[PDB]
Amino acid sequence: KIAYLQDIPRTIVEKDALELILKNTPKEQWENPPEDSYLYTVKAFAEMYGPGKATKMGWWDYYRLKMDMPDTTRLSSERELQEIEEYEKLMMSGKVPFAVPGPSGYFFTGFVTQWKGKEPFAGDQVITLTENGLFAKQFLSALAFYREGLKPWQRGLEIGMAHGYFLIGPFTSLGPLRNTPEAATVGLLCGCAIVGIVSIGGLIFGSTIKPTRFDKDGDKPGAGFIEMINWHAVGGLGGAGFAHALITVF
Amino acid sequence: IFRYINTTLWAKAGHFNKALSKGAKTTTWIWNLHDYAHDFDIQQRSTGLIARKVFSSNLAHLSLVFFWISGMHLHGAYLSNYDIWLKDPKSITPSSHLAYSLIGQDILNSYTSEYFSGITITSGFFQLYRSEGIITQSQLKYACATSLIATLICLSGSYLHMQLMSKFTSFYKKFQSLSQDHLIIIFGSRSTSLSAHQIHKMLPANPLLDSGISKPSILQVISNSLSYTLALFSTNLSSTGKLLNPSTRSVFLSQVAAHHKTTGVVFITLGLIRFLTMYKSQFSILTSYIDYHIVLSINLALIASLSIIVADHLTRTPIYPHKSTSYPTILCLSIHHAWLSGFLIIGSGAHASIFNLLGSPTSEIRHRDPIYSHLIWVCIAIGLHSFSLYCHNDTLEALGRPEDIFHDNSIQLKAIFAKQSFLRAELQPDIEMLDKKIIRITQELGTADFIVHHIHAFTIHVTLLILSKGVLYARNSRFVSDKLELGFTYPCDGPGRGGTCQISPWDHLFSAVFWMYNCLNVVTFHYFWKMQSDVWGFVSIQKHISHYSQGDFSVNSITINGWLRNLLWSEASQVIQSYALSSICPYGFIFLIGHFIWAFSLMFLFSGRAYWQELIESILWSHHKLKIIPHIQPRALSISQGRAVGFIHYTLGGIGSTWAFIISRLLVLT
Amino acid sequence: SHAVKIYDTCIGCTLCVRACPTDVLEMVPASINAAKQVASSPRVEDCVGCKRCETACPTDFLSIRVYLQDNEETQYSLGLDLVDWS
Amino acid sequence: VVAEAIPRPEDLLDSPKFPMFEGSTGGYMSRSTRERHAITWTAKGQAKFEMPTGGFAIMNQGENLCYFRKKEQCIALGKQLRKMKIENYKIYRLKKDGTVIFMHPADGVFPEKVNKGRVQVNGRPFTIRGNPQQSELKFTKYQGKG
Amino acid sequence: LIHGYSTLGANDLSVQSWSFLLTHLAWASGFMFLISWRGYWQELIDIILYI
Amino acid sequence: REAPKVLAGTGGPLPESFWDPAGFTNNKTDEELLFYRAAELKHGRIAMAAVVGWFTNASGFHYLGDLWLKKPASDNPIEAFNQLSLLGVFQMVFFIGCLEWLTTVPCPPPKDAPWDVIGMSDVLEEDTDENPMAEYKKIQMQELNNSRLAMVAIIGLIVQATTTG
Ligand code: CLA
Ligand code: CLA
Ligand code: CLA
Ligand SMILES: CC1=C(/C=C/C(C)=C/C=C/C(C)=C/C=C/C=C(C)/C=C/C=C(C)/C=C/C2=C(C)CCCC2(C)C)C(C)(C)CCC1
Ligand code: SF4
């Protein structure tokens, strides 16, 4: 075995502490401890003080030696070493022990979410719960923009109804004429104007970028997107009018 | 051992770094020598020398702080009106700071007492001394002597540890030992020691002064020998903080002593608990953060957070006697600790970046794009929301439509959680006052407070965005894929890829300093205006309150023009009209100098070093013409140094401007 | 794309080649210096423009000169990562 | 020199040549980019290294293969490998169609090592000051490109 | 000028005060284009584009 | 047990004690047992929020309901329900109705784990061997044991309130 690790006096370092050092230190470093490693000091002293060597030390030299050796509490135990050796294995295997940020910190949720996607080198395929979970996937797929089997005008109508119904509120309330007796027809006009402006922007997008994911086969490129935008304008008008009708009637 | 402590390297400047061994060929060598002076990591020799340097430098700085404390104590014993302040603190401004009668500087000393003229100090040292039971000049003499002895001891220890520690030294790496002994023996066993000090020297003394015996029978009663007074002599039941001491306008010192005793007990019990408590989750943090720069960053962030807590807790949780009425002291104690919180937070970010570049980072750096992206979005959201409520109020007030602005008398944004935050203090439904001065009244939070708190949140988030972006994108980025090899601080990677200026973490700190300064200038202004408008001020015997700003905050701070007019213009009348006025001449002059320095920084901030290098070469032509050859070749400042100088001058000038503006006004009003 | 030109003053350091982060430069044999080699820039379409080659060149004035052309930028000369121009 | 058969990264999921790497958001942005750069090398021991796109990695004792969006990242990883005495690494540019273009050790010899058959491209036979004045070449072939 | 528009009424200098504040904002806004330089923002734009 | 093995090691005082002192699970099929758990977790998850909602409302924090009724509603959560404006209650029902619709029809949980309403099963491992993770079974215990306590707790609140105040 290694020469300097045999018959080392307990006064230099205790048996349990030495075993803890040897466990913490990687095996390949036992023969020649590097430098600034407790094992390096153990070697540099056990080769000077021992049974066949200098058996006594000055009180100050021994005091300084006792403050260079580990104090039996600053060394990781077997379970902690297992924690590290397995945490690093998880991290390198592409799996992340799931954690959630909290009040300046994060709680470990005790879950192994496989992190690297199907393309391990792709940066945007790292799968997370909020985008790649079952609920997230089915929610995104079932949106009007993505729902299967919807004609482009249906997607446009649904999105427009949502936008037009919502956009009335910010104007009819806390608007310039929020306290007038009408106070809602103004909001209706402003919401219809916002719907028209964003529809014009969508028409610009469809006449410049021309997305072709909604076009049926053998059609003018971007025709599906243009139809979706026109029916979004129609749906925005309808939703704004419906919200105004509900506000006035009720 | 100590035979190697030789002066032979004193003449050999730049010895510590092997990049400076070529000699001072250019003037850049001087700046590099100053820049690498404390960078022990990159200096020559093994890692043991790094530990020795770090520990001994810590001891030397501790000796420096002790020397500063000793200087303050000697100023208080031999260059102060602390006697008359003790006799009548409500009529005498603290002053342990004189000015020599040279160049007419005599105009700086002002009337503080009938027998004393000097500069009104706002450090709050007099209140600290009174809370420390210091009455006679001999006590301050011995405090100064003990602080000088501590300075000598710490200096000698710093000298010794450069050779006591060796290559085998390992006591600094024993983090379990450090944490345990620190926690128990200092936070627990020294907190109870201070509790003992208070119970045995303050309660025997401070109640005697509050009992009206400023005489205290000289030493017959003041010099202890008062075991017939009981420890909890005047607790008056109640709850700590609900009822203040009516005489000194502060929490009773018996309650403070009990607090220190209980906090020491709690710290000792936590040290005992740490033998078996919650672990194995911060364990990756435990193993990956054993390095100088990471622990330095952690400690800097912690100390800065504690500093901001101190800033907010020193003002309206009055602990010190006769300190709540001393409004300049309260203002200084809040604002100085606010600035230190900001600066040390920025330093924590910088050393986090340094640790990332030297050590190996952790798991959070791999999803850095979502982190530093949602941070971007939140910064944009609260900037386009908080500030613009000011822009909206401003525009609609200029248009003459006050009913459409965000105010209390208009569309109002109620501070719901703060208004439901009566948990803190929970005092009785009235105010407290000592002598024509308000001690503390609850700040009624309305719309303006809501908007300014959101401004604070926005500025904090943007500064944090800069810091975390520098930290997370230190090793590499989609822009440059080998930022690790470029080091910690570099000007750029070149004009390529469109331009790579200021990608280094050092430049991220450079921007973050500007943003932190902008962040807590608003904090300083919010505090300075809110306290004057709604807390501080005179009183009327009919229970009516006349504040200093006459309630300008709730009616003017809703618009940027209100801040410009009622804070930076109307409240700057004291500092601007401060010439030939005895106390406040230096504050007006320093206001002017701060403006000059702040504008001077812009020369370094806006310009590049190539123009200055070419100008220096043009001048060097004339020097060479007359056979005047500087062999230390004149080179313009390096890009990083230009940015550093610009940032330093910018922050220094702005801080000086605010400093003069607030201090002169509070000295005039008081 | 930028324009990276090599001049006759080259002394075959190979430092410019080693400093290039996108393998724009290369060493070619020549007979105008004691090193019997001069630099060449056969792939300036990959030149981002970092000018590390100019930093590494020890001749009195750089034997390698990079001329920035901003109205000329391609996806390779800009180091585009999130976006493809092909 | 024989170019390898580097397949498109979207068609080589779960390959044995991929080193064990942690995986981060810094990888090439799919769904928007189709041009990928691939670097392959043969190592001797599973020595840990650092990916150019954040996160660390462990090589394989045999062949290795990595995909990156930019040639700069591949060259940075190549320098990092060459610091570990790992030669014989090749960097390929993958076209959208899947065409493989052999880029970095173009002639099989690293660019810092002189190889026969090379010619000084973009060479100018004078000192840098020998360039003609821009004013002289106005409205010629070299209007602003002296 | 500062008294132009306030919580006491407005004068015919209200436009002057509003433009005063707007030009202060414009002057300070150009500081970041002069002090902060490109690479920081290029990384910021890369992050936003990632989003 | 056979079929109760699909919900094994997940109940009882100690985690691996199949309690069932009524035979409610024996003779029942695997899908029925999984559906019984889906009912248990859904009751418990609502019970946990119900208890939290009860306490933040019985202490004096009913802002939306104090700002809608223009008066501080009574602290007693049962009595505060009556005072709460009928518009508020109907919107409360509709929001839960949308959530219940959303989970069931558009984004259905799997049929093997009908309680994965967020759907971690497509990114979770649950079968690895790491210690600093793969404690997902333990956090399943904490959800179930806490939720079961919340179920009897909230009933105690309602029963005591409706009887002994
Ligand atoms: C007063 C000058 C000023 C202003 C306005 C800004 C503004 C900004 N800085 Mg900036 N900065 C400045 C000076 C300034 N900086 C200086 C001097 C430095 C020193 C180097 C920096 C350094 C700096 C850094 C380092 C960072 C910022 C960031 C930001 C952005 C975060 C705040 C935000 O999104 O709010 C929104 C922007 C506003 C201006 C708020 C008001 C918006 C108006 C009032 C509402 C809209 C007007 C309306 C639509 C009119 C339409 C236009 C009209 C033509 C029709 C923002 C664009 C951070 C960033 O971008 O991260 C997100 C960041 O990282 N800055
Ligand atoms: C406990 C606190 C602490 C400690 C121990 C360190 C330690 C260190 N820092 Mg550091 N830092 C800190 C706080 C701290 N810092 C804070 C709060 C900030 C934020 C501003 C920084 C920002 C910072 C940066 C940006 C950098 C460091 C660097 C360094 C390293 C070398 C420092 C050096 O050689 O400078 C030598 C010392 C000086 C040059 C001091 C010059 C004086 C300063 C610059 C101006 C002060 C003006 C003064 C206050 C006003 C004058 C008064 C006027 C009236 C005349 C070293 C490890 C550098 C490094 O490379 O790290 C490895 C580096 O690049 N730090
Ligand atoms: C909605 C109620 C509900 C449902 C459907 C389940 C369902 C389940 N529990 Mg369970 N449990 C609940 C509430 C519920 N629990 C509560 C509140 C507690 C705390 C005491 C427990 C404690 C518990 C333990 C300790 C264990 C289970 C187990 C199980 C599983 C085995 C099937 C079973 O026990 O009978 C399913 C059928 C029912 C529970 C029928 C509901 C009760 C009927 C209707 C009569 C109860 C009426 C009651 C007396 C009066 C109501 C008021 C009351 C509060 C006083 C199954 C998934 C076992 C398991 O999976 O471990 C592996 C197990 O060991 N449970
Ligand atoms: C807060 C909340 C939330 C959210 C929510 C939301 C987002 C909502 C929305 C809502 C909405 C947004 C709704 C809307 C609706 C709409 C509607 C309901 C519409 C309708 C329309 C109509 C019906 C129309 C019709 C028409 C047409 C189409 C045309 C012609 C004319 C007429 C009128 C006939 C969450 C969950 C996050 C959480 C918490 C709570
Ligand atoms: S660094 Fe300059 S001198 Fe050296 S080989 Fe390259 S171009 Fe020639």
What is the token pair recorded at B348? 């924590």
Residues 6+ apart with CB under 8 A from A8: A18, A42, A46, A50
Resolution (angstroms) stands at: 2.7
Q: Are 3 or more Cβ–Cβ pairs between E and F shorter than 8 Å? A: no
- What's the count of helices (H) and strands (E) in chain D, helices before strands? 1, 8
Cα separation, E9 vs B208, whole angstroms: 56
Distance CA A47, CA A4 (A): 6
Pairing, β D36-42 against β A95-102: unpaired
The type of residue at B150 is A
Closest listed ligand to the CA of A238: 4
Give B367's DSSP letter: T
- CA pair distance B350, F43, nearest whole angstrom: 49
C-beta of residue B546 within 8 angstroms of C-beta of residue B536: no
Centre a 10 Å sphere on the Cβ of residue B48 and count the other Cβ atoms it contains: 16
Which chain D residues are Cβ-neighbours of A125 within 8 angstroms? 27, 30
CB-CB neighbours of B562 under 10 Å: 23
Characterize the bridge pairing of strands D123-124 and C3-7: parallel
Q: How far apart are CA E28 and CA E13, in angstroms?
A: 23
- Helices B639-669 and B505-534, axial angle in degrees (round to 10): 10
Q: Are D73 and D52 contacting, i.e. CB atoms less than 8 angstroms apart?
A: yes
d(CA B635, CA B644) in angstroms, rounded, equals 17
Chains that touch B (3 or more CB pairs under 8 A): A, C, D, E, F
Q: How far is the CA of A164 from the centre of ligand 5 (A)?
A: 66
User: Taking CB atoms and an 8 Å limit, are C44 and D122 in contact across chains?
Assistant: yes
CA of B35 to the centre of ligand 2 (A): 9
Report yes or no: B420 at the F interface, CB cutoff 8 Å.
Answer: yes
Backbone φ/ψ region at B525: left (φ over 0), alpha (ψ -120 to 50), beta? alpha
Residue B292 contacts residue B54 (beta carbons within 8 Å): yes
User: What chain A residue is nearest to D18 in terms of C-alpha separation?
Assistant: A120
DSSP element (H, E) containing B179: helix B175-181
Ramachandran category for residue B237: left, alpha or beta (phi over 0 → left; psi -120 to 50 → alpha) = left
* Residue B80 amino acid letter: S
Q: What's the CA gap between B317 and F61, in Å, rounded?
A: 27
Helix (H) and strand (E) counts for chain F? 5, 0
> Alpha-carbon distance B393 to B245, whole Å?
43
For tokens 């491992």, name the residue: F125
The three-state secondary structure class of B275 is coil
Cα separation, A41 vs A13, whole angstroms: 11
CA atoms of A119 and B427, how far apart (whole Å): 61
Name A229's Cβ contacts closer than 8 Å, sequence gap at least 6. A156, A199, A202, A203, A205, A206
Distance CA B569, CA B554 (A): 17
Which of residues 47 through 76 in chain C touch D, CB cutoff 8 A?
Answer: 48, 61-63, 65, 76
* A100 bridge partner residues: A107
Cβ within 8 Å, pair B494-C21: no
Test F120 with A111 for CB contact under 8 angstroms: yes
| B239 token code pair | 């709850």
* C-alpha–C-alpha distance, residues F10 and B206, integer Å: 63
Contacts of A14-22 spanning 24+ positions with Cβ under 8 A: A14/A72, A16/A72, A17/A69, A17/A70, A17/A72, A17/A75, A18/A42, A20/A70, A20/A72, A20/A75, A20/A77, A21/A70, A21/A75
Q: Rounded distance, CA B93 to CA B82, Å?
A: 9
Ligand 5 probe mutation, C4, C11, C47, most atoms within 8 A of CB? C11
Kindly identify which residue of chain A lies nearest to residue B170, measuring between CA atoms.
A68
- Residue reference for tokens 């005498």: B92
Containing C26, the helix (H) or strand (E) segment is: strand C26-29
Beta-carbon neighbour count of residue B93 at 10 Å?
A: 24
**Atom 32 of ligand 2, residue of closest alpha carbon:** B38
Rounded alpha-carbon distances, angstroms, from residue A210 to A196, A225, D86:
19, 7, 48
- What technique determined this structure? cryo-EM
Q: Which residue has the tokens 């670097």?
A: D39
Q: Please tell me which of the candidates A83, A95, A135 has its beta carbon nearest to residue F119.
A: A135
| Distant-in-sequence, close-in-space partners of B336: CB < 8 Å, separation ≥ 6 | B311
CA distances B598 to B441, B577, B648, B650, Å, are 37, 21, 9, 5
List of residues 6+ apart from B12 with CB closer than 8 A: none
CB within 8 Å of A193: residues ≥ 6 apart: none
Ligand 2 atom showing the smallest separation from residue B42 Cα: 62
- Of D31, D56, D66, nearest to A121 by CB-CB distance is D66
Q: Is the CB of A166 under 6 A from ligand 4?
A: yes
Smallest CA separation from ligand 4 atom 30, residue: A238
| Helical pair B447-472 and B327-358, crossing angle rounded to 10 deg | 30
Six-digit token string for C76: 């390779």
Check residue A190 and give left, alpha or beta (phi > 0: left; psi -120 to 50: alpha). Answer: alpha
Question: Closest to D54 (Cβ–Cβ): which among B360, B366, B482?
Answer: B366
Q: Please name the amino acid found at residue B328.
A: P
Per the structure block, which two tokens stand in for A90?
A: 């998880």
Measured in Å, residue B91 CA sits from the centre of ligand 4 at 68
User: Which residues of chain E lie closer than 8 angstroms to C50, CB-CB?
Assistant: none
Helix/strand/coil for B640: helix
CA atoms within 13 A on the CB side of A61: 10
| DSSP helix/strand/coil, D20 | strand
The verdict on the CB of residue F121 being under 6 Å from ligand 3 is no
Pick the closest to residue A183 from A169, A197, A196 (CA basis).
Answer: A169
Number of residues written out for chain B? 670
Instruction: Determine whether the interchain pair F131/A133 forms a contact, defined as Cβ–Cβ distance below 8 Å.
Output: no
C14 interface with D at CB cutoff 8 Å: yes
Residue B517 CB-density burial (10 A; 0-12 exposed, 13-18 middle, 19+ buried): buried
The H or E element spanning position C28 is strand C26-29
Closest CA to A143 of A152, A135, A131, A155: A155
Q: Which two tokens stand for residue A225?
A: 């997107």
Contacting residues of D for B366, CB less than 8 Å apart = 22-26, 54-55
Spatial CA neighbour of C85 closest among C44, C49, C45, C51:
C45
In angstroms, the CA B422 to CA B54 distance is 46
What is the DSSP secondary-structure string of B380-426?
Answer: HHHHHHHHHHHHHHHHHHHTT-GGGSBSTTSB----HHHHT-TTSS-
DSSP codes, A75-123? S--HHHHHHHHHHHHHHHTTEEEEEEEETTEEEEEEEEEE-S-SSTTBS
Measuring CA to CA, how many Å separate B95 from each of B71, B85, B321, B358?
14, 9, 17, 48
Q: Which residues of A touch B171 (CB under 8 A)?
A: 67-68
Q: How far apart are CA A24 and CA A78, in angstroms?
A: 9
Residue count of chain E, please give it: 51
Q: What does chain D come to in residues?
A: 146
Q: To probe the interface with D, which of A119, A128, A140 has the most D CB atoms within 10 Å?
A: A119
User: Which single residue is written with the structure tokens 């006052």?
Assistant: B433
Task: Answer yes or no: is the C-beta of F146 below 6 A from any ligand 3 atom.
Answer: no
Q: How far is the CA of F26 from the centre of ligand 3 (A)?
A: 14
